[PDB]
Amino acid sequence: HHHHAPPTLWSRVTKFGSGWGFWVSPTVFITTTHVVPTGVKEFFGEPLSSIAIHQAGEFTQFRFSKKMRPDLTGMVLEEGCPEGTVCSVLIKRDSGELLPLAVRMGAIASMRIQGRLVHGQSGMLLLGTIPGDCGAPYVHKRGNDWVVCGVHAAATKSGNTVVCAVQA
Numbered sequence: 001h002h003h004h005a006p007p008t009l010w011s012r013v014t015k016f017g018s019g020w021g022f023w024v025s026p027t028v029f030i031t032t033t034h035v036v037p038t039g040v041k042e043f044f045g046e047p048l049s050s051i052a053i054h055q056a057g058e059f060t061q062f063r064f065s066k067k068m069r070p071d072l073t074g075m076v077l078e079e080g081c082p083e084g085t086v087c088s089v090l091i092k093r094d095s096g097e098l099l100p101l102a103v104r105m106g107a108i109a110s111m112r113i114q115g116r117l118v119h120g121q122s123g124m125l126l127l128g129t130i131p132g133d134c135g136a137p138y139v140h141k142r143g144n145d146w147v148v149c150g151v152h153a154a155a156t157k158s159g160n161t162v163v164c165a166v167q168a
């Protein structure tokens with residue numbers, strides 16, 4: 001129904017590097033830093049010169065100088081969700097399957113994950129995440145508008161707790 005992730009929202013989820021990223025708007029693409037390709041001079045055809053790239057705490061944002069997805073409306077990127085919010089992780093698999101995972105979000109905090117400092121939010125799954133799912137967006141529908149508040153970065157060994165990286 002209307003309040004499940006619509007097809008256009010899923011169409012923002014894009015295979016990228018060793019995971020996924022997400023078109024927040026025609027010009028802004030977000031992902032988790034560790035999936036990003038290394039040593040490239042262009043992204044989606046555009047030279048790095050034309051791209052503002054902001055990377056911190058495992059969150060990466062690309063702001064392009066051209067409309068890359070002109071078909072899309074701009075949506076709100078927030079710095080995480082409030083504790084208790086139920087978000088969906090929009091997981092695409094290479095098979096083509098779409099797997100919206102319901103997650104109850106916890107607190108925003110700094111975490112050390114395999115040596116890297118993550119500006120993260122943990123959440124409890126309400127179906128699990130696997131290697132290759134990173135970059136997948138954490139989204140929720142606030143009244144009439146969809147909000148994106150993080151990108152998938154990690155899961156506990158049990159798989160029952162996930163972490164998304166959030167923007168400063």
Ligand SMILES: *[C@@H](O)[C@H](C[C@@H]1CCNC1=O)NC(=O)[C@H](CC1CCCCC1)NC(=O)OCC(C)(C)c1cccc(Cl)c1
Binds near residue numbers: 058113163
């Ligand atoms: C996506 O690349 C992958 C998704 C994970 C894999 C298994 N299920 C998932 O959801 N993410 C990772 O493998 C992640 C990579 C690090 C790399 C450096 C930057 C941060 C992300 N590692 C990971 O999830 O580690 C799992 C633990 C148990 C080692 C872990 C340690 C510390 C905190 C947590 Cl929540 C988990």
